[PDB]
Predict the 3D structure of the following.
Amino acid sequence: TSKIALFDQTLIASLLQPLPDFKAYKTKVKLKISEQRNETSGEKELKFEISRSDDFEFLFSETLNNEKYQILARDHDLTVDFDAFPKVIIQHLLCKNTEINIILDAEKNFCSFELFSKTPISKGKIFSIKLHAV
Amino acid sequence: TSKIALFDQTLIASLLQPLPDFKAYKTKVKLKISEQRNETSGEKELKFEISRSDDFEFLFSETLNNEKYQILARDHDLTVDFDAFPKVIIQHLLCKNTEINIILDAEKNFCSFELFSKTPISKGKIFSIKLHAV
């Protein structure tokens, strides 16, 4: 396989899910970040994967190539390039007292993974990515 | 007068203005923040004022009441209330190596004042406010 594991940790996240109105719980979630070669183009992809032992259906992922990352960087004001992005995010996740929100779709077809680094004035959202059900 | 001066400093800002395409210059700008009583409702208003000695037409301001601040906080993920907001922004401006962008309208009818606090991953926008020509 071309898959290289970059990060694999159990983290605490806030899980928001509808009942229309949201119910909120802190939950341990396993986050995996890896790099891999796209089988059709051969280009480098980053893969984000989330799971949790509470629910076998709670299995979501998304792959990010350089082009999709450029959209993400534009949308979220990221100042690092695609090459530096996993390194800086992993350094943040292991160094900083960050906050994760996962907003679960009613039918568990997807979730929004949101990473924050709070400041005294604001939520400090770093980025968000839509993860699809596996 | 009901006006109470809260902040009055000359700061370095990046000024972006059209030629369609933007030309960019660093410029010293005078920023004033004050609180005042609205003459019609009697409610507390924050007033933001920018000027610079390069251009007599470069004179912009906007007033923020509690209701308008709630929209601003929602739009920019601010976690402080209206009462704490000038205090925390002034503490930031005097303590942190912040970055200001001013995006000037072609006819100088308004500008967007944008405050940032860069991180290793992102621009770290705190908020932006539209200031109108005085």
